Design an enzyme around this catalytic site. Structure first.
Site, short mmCIF file in Angstrom:
data_model
loop_
_atom_site.label_atom_id
_atom_site.label_comp_id
_atom_site.label_asym_id
_atom_site.label_seq_id
_atom_site.Cartn_x
_atom_site.Cartn_y
_atom_site.Cartn_z
N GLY A 173 1.78 7.11 8.61
CA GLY A 173 3.33 6.99 8.45
C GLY A 173 4.00 6.20 8.89
O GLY A 173 5.48 6.34 8.44
N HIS B 53 0.89 -1.19 0.37
CA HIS B 53 -0.14 0.25 0.57
C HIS B 53 0.76 1.14 -0.13
O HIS B 53 0.32 2.12 -0.56
CB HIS B 53 -0.64 -0.06 0.93
N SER C 34 3.59 3.03 8.02
CA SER C 34 3.64 2.00 7.40
C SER C 34 4.48 2.19 6.78
O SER C 34 5.73 2.61 5.84
CB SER C 34 1.83 2.78 6.06
N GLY C 35 4.62 0.46 6.30
CA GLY C 35 6.37 0.32 5.46
C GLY C 35 7.14 -0.41 6.51
O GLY C 35 7.86 -1.32 5.83
N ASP D 147 -0.09 -8.24 2.23
CA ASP D 147 0.41 -6.47 1.94
C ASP D 147 1.64 -6.05 2.01
O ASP D 147 2.72 -6.23 3.28
CB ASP D 147 -0.21 -5.64 2.80
#
Ligand SMILES: [Ca+2]
Length: 223
Positions: A175, A40, A177-178, A84
């Site tokens: 923020g 994402h 994320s990942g 994801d």
């Protein structure tokens, strides 16, 4: 990261910032040429920033390297966030040192109760917005599959796990994320999703990296 602590400069040497004119996602360096992040987080025009602490100030240990390619997992579903995960290749190999270092992939899946380190430059408030510029850290346990599924009925797949605190107050957030979830020196999770941040009975949900090791290794070997 909500309810965390300031990590300390370059104490999480595998943590990267993905920058497209601004920080938009975290990632984890898994070798000199490759970063693992969330699907994402996919977009064009990614620069990988390694050796960062304050992402708004050049402090002297950074390496800025443009991505040459990104590879989103073939089975990623953006509605359910199943699978994801995404790989990003650097145009040139990072120079590895004590402050810029790769994190090992798991050889086995981590169990509920395992203590992990979650890190990122995401929002530090559960209500409202405040972005830190230095890297924030959170120590958090992996939660049981049962408690995870009970918290998020109908939403937890075999490629996801929950980590954090059902009481609320401590969580990853927008923020982050990942970014990495590292347990006993292995990358077990990727910051994926949650309902708000640090809310009671709504723990963070993370991509289960151990399910993707074969895909990661094979993809790296041919790209
Ligand atoms: Ca910096």
């Amino acid at each position: 990261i909500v309810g965390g602590y300031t990590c300390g400069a370059n104490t999480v040497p595998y943590q990267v910032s993905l920058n497209s004119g601004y920080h938009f996602c975290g990632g984890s360096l898994i070798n000199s040429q490759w970063v693992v992040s969330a699907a994402h987080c996919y977009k064009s025009g990614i620069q990988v920033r390694l050796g960062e602490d304050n992402i708004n100030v050049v402090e002297g240990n950074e390496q800025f390297i443009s991505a040459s390619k990104s590879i989103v997992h073939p089975s990623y579903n953006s509605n359910t966030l199943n699978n994801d995960i995404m790989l990003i290749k650097l145009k040139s190999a990072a120079s590895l040192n004590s402050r810029v270092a790769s994190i090992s992939l798991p050889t086995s899946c981590a169990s509920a109760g395992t203590q992990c380190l979650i890190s990122g430059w995401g929002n530090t408030k559960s209500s409202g917005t405040s972005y830190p510029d230095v890297l924030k850290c959170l120590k958090a346990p992996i939660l049981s599959d049962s408690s995870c599924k009970s918290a998020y009925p109908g939403q937890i797949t075999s490629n996801m796990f929950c980590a954090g605190y059902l009481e609320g107050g401590k969580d990853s957030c927008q923020g982050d994320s990942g970014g990495p979830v590292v347990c006993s020196g292995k990358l077990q999770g990727i910051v994926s999703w949650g309902s708000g941040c640090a809310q009671k009975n709504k723990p963070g949900v993370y991509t289960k990296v151990c399910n993707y090791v074969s895909w990661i290794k094979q993809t790296i070997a041919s790209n």
